[PDB]
Write a protein that binds this ligand. Sequence first.
Ligand SMILES: Nc1ncnc2[nH]cnc12
Ligand SMILES: Nc1ncnc2[nH]cnc12
Ligand SMILES: [Cl-]
Ligand SMILES: [Cl-]
Ligand SMILES: [Cl-]
Ligand code: NA
Ligand code: NA
Ligand code: NI
Lengths: 182, 181
Amino acid sequence: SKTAQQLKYIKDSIKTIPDYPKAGILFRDVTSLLENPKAYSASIELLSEHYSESGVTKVVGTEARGFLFGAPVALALGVGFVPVRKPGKLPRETISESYELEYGTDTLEIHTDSIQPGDKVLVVDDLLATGGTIEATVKLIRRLGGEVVHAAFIINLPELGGEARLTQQGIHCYSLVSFDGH
Amino acid sequence: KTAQQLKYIKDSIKTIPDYPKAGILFRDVTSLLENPKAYSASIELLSEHYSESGVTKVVGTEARGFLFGAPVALALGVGFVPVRKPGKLPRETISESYELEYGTDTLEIHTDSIQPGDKVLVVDDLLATGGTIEATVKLIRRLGGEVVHAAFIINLPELGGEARLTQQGIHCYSLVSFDGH
Ligand SMILES: Nc1ncnc2[nH]cnc12
Ligand SMILES: Nc1ncnc2[nH]cnc12
Ligand SMILES: [Cl-]
Ligand SMILES: [Cl-]
Ligand SMILES: [Cl-]
Ligand code: NA
Ligand code: NA
Ligand code: NI
């Protein structure tokens, strides 16, 4: 009983903002969940319970909203958190992967020391839309030898394809809530 | 026992010579993040320190500030509110500029997230010049929030950030300090 009520409360605490960033999009605003202590802490408790017996040895989160759920999950699971960032922020040796934007490409980096061949890695992000940044993040992990077959999200937008696209690259996706639309 | 915990924290932070230029001993908080014991210790001390302060909201600026402020907010049981680079926040915002090496940038906050009566803690990873914190403090006070505290993992006191923040009425708390710019 507790857990289905907490999911509903989580989903209710995420505001919909029409026409951001442009017209016709029904933007799903995770910041309203952040500022509700009850919703935020439930979102972390539920993700942490979900993976507590999964053998995860590390969490990776991508900058910036991903830090907000990946790092607390890491803390609750008792494992290291590893950030993936835009270029030029990480100070130690990195590798990088480029990914498609609507116009052009961008890049994500990870510290080459922070993933090893025996790691079992959980990727955590706020919101799964088309999946491009997470697909690049999976590649970075795999290039260093880490296993990544789990990724977890507060929010899934399945009509944008991101879940199907990751799930066909061998990632088992878990999302607390989902919304229709683009 | 208490200095063993801070020493444990401090030793988990790596020093990278000559990044991003020669003479700079870069203090790299990412090695603390990958040590779960150092990382949880650092959140436990920060939150313990403010446990009787009456804080009602924690503010952290993107992105490293999110790694320390949001866990602190979860431990205090209070809302987290991000301050962001422009163009990322969906609801109504206000903006403040601060200074870079070359030029200026701006931070934004949601106007609905801070209100008169709020007691706000600002948390960041590392106190350097303090330009983003001063900007953050102004955002919060323009919305009527009260902010008298800022908390950090690392202080670089040779950059003068604590003095610059005392002058705006902010008490700084840091867990460890390093020399150098
Ligand atoms: N509706 C939406 N809300 C939040 N982020 C998105 N990314 C793509 N569509 C989005
Ligand atoms: N030595 C240093 N390490 C990390 N961040 C900094 N910002 C300014 N100086 C720094
Ligand atoms: Cl982001
Ligand atoms: Cl499997
Ligand atoms: Cl940052
Ligand atoms: Na490696
Ligand atoms: Na307000
Ligand atoms: Ni499988």
